[PDB]
Each structure stands twice: as C-alpha cells, then as structure tokens.
Design an enzyme around this catalytic site. Structure first.
Site, short mmCIF file in Angstrom:
data_model
loop_
_atom_site.label_atom_id
_atom_site.label_comp_id
_atom_site.label_asym_id
_atom_site.label_seq_id
_atom_site.Cartn_x
_atom_site.Cartn_y
_atom_site.Cartn_z
N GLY A 226 21.37 -33.14 33.11
CA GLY A 226 20.18 -33.17 32.98
C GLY A 226 19.42 -32.58 34.74
N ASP A 227 19.49 -31.89 35.46
CA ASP A 227 18.82 -31.45 37.10
C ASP A 227 19.97 -30.60 37.10
OD1 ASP A 227 15.97 -32.52 36.20
OD2 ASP A 227 16.41 -34.49 37.90
MG LIG Z 1 14.86 -34.29 36.85
MG LIG Z 2 17.73 -30.01 32.22
MG LIG Z 3 15.80 -31.93 34.31
#
Ligand SMILES: [Mg+2]
Ligand SMILES: [Mg+2]
Ligand SMILES: [Mg+2]
Length: 248
Positions: free
Chosen positions: A112-113
């Site tokens: 995700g991040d």
């Molecule tokens: Mg995030």
């Molecule tokens: Mg992402």
């Molecule tokens: Mg993200």
DNA sequence: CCAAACTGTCTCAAGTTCCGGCG
DNA sequence: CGCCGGAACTTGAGACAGTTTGG
C-alpha cells in the site's frame, strides 16, 4: 494461507491504501465500511477480492464485496458492521502479531504505502560512473511517524527521515535488505516482482562491478523494476549508462 | 572506489464523506 | 438501522534525483 495471515495482510492494506468508516446518513441511517482503494482494477480483482472473499466466508459475513470506480482510483468496499469492528479491534492486537502474522501485516502495509526502489545514480567517483542503489521504504504522514519508528524497532535495521508533511522508513544496507526482502517476499502481491528483482540485483552486484556488460545487464533489471512501479520522474536508465560507458 | 547516509523534488494515487435507494 | 452504488471532495503518498560522508 489461512485467516490469520489473510486478515493480517488485509488490515495492512486497509491501513495503507484504505480505511474503516462508521457513517451517519440523513433519515437516521448508517453504514460501516471496510475499504481498500487502488488505481488498478485488475490488481484488486486478481489479488484482493479473492482474499477478502475468503476471509468473509470464514467469518460468516454476509455483505457483498463491492468494486466501485472513482474518479482517480478504484475501490474495493465491504459494507459490514461486523467486518468493520473485526478490523478496528484487530488494530489493537497488532503489537502481539508473531513472526509470520507480522510479516503478512507488513506486506499489506508495503503493497500500500511502500516502495521497492532501484536506482542508477551518476557519480564520477565510481569506475562505471554510477552507483547502483537499492531502497526499501514506507511513507507515512508525519503525524504517524510513531508508526515508522515502530518499524525500525520491529525490523531491526533502517531509520526514519522527515521531509515535511510526510516521513519515510528507509532500509538500503544491502545485506539486511536482502535478508528482509527474502522474508517479506512470499507475503507480497502487488510488489512481489520488484522484490525478487531487487534480490537478484543484490546477488549479482559484485559481478556487475567486474565488467561493463554485466553492469549494463543488471541496470536492465533496474529498468524492469521502474517499469513495474508508478515511474514518472526517472532520468538515468541502462541506456544512459551504456552511452557513458561507450564514450569511455 | 565503493557502501550508506543525507537532502530535495515531481506528479500523482490515494483516502474521506455525502446522496438517494432498499429490506 | 444497516446494506447497496455512486461520486464528490480532500489529501497522503510513491518514486525518483542529486549530493556528501567515511571506510
Ligand atoms: Mg496510506
Ligand atoms: Mg498505494
Ligand atoms: Mg497509500
């Protein structure tokens, strides 16, 4: 894969690219959402939907997995009060995640991040005029810097750097990096390919330094990683390197 | 001459909340 | 009241580049 791992991974993805929402609507109505947003619809269908469907079935949750198209991204959404509270409470049990469950969780946060980066940095001090740089990073808004600090404590290596509104957890040391990615890789979905290409580059870095052709080959693998990532501001490629070596 | 840290930037891809309908 | 479908609305990201340090 079991619910222990699937649920940990999803919570990670939820925290990274989604959220948990308790909504209040007009007419005394309400809603509870478990969400994961992602630019690519195929990525959601191929990796996320199947895993969420599995968890939902095992938990006896009756809500439907919805895939909604937004202006800037697609959204996988489950409208379920039960699933909402399940993840919200798990949020407090993360600190107790053991080895493998923590890795699944981390993999979720990474897909995700996170960013698995390979770069060719021009530096006249090197024989082939460039440094082969590898980076594992997780970006989080500066208010959640405590989270990145936690990563340093859990993983064992790496550090945190602040760059204004956001901050990053960073790991570039080749040996620890190789060890960490060897452990996380089986749990990744979105960034599994880049993880394995980084692993291959590390294993060939010494040989890459002994010959112009082998160096260019390895630079080819970094081109591949950039292609897999949302590459927009890249400048030095394997062909750029070739031109420099040719003139030498 | 190289591994690793330090410092800065480009261009989005995320995240969050409001609406009308259903059972 | 909680489960669909949508989408407007408001950000946190990702993914590099460039430069310097210290063995
Ligand atoms: Mg995030
Ligand atoms: Mg992402
Ligand atoms: Mg993200």
């Amino acid at each position: 894969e079991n619910v222990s791992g699937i649920s940990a991974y999803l919570l990670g993805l939820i925290w990274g690219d989604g959220g948990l929402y308790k909504l209040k609507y007009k007419g005394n109505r309400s809603e509870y959402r478990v969400v994961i947003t992602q630019k690519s619809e195929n990525l959601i269908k191929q990796f996320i939907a199947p895993r969420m469907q599995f968890l939902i079935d095992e938990l006896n949750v009756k809500s439907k997995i919805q895939i909604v198209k937004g202006d800037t991204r697609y959204e996988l959404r489950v409208s379920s009060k039960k699933l909402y509270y399940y993840f919200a409470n798990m949020l407090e049990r993360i600190r107790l995640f053991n080895g493998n469950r923590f890795l699944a969780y981390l993999a979720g946060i990474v897909d995700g991040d996170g960013s698995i980066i390979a770069q060719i940095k021009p530096n006249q001090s090197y024989k082939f005029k460039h440094q082969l740089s590898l980076t594992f990073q997780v970006t989080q808004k500066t208010e959640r810097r405590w989270f990145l600090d936690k990563l340093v404590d859990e993983i064992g290596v790496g550090y945190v750097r602040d760059r204004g509104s956001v901050s990053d957890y960073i790991l570039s040391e080749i040996k620890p990096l190789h060890n960490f990615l060897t452990q996380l890789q089986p749990f990744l979905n979105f960034k599994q390919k880049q993880a394995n290409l980084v692993l291959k580059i590390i294993e060939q870095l010494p040989s890459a330094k002994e010959s112009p052709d082998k160096f260019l080959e390895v630079c080819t693998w970094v081109d591949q990683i950039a292609a897999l990532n949302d590459s927009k501001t890249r400048k030095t490629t394997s062909e750029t390197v070739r031109a420099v070596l040719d003139s030498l």
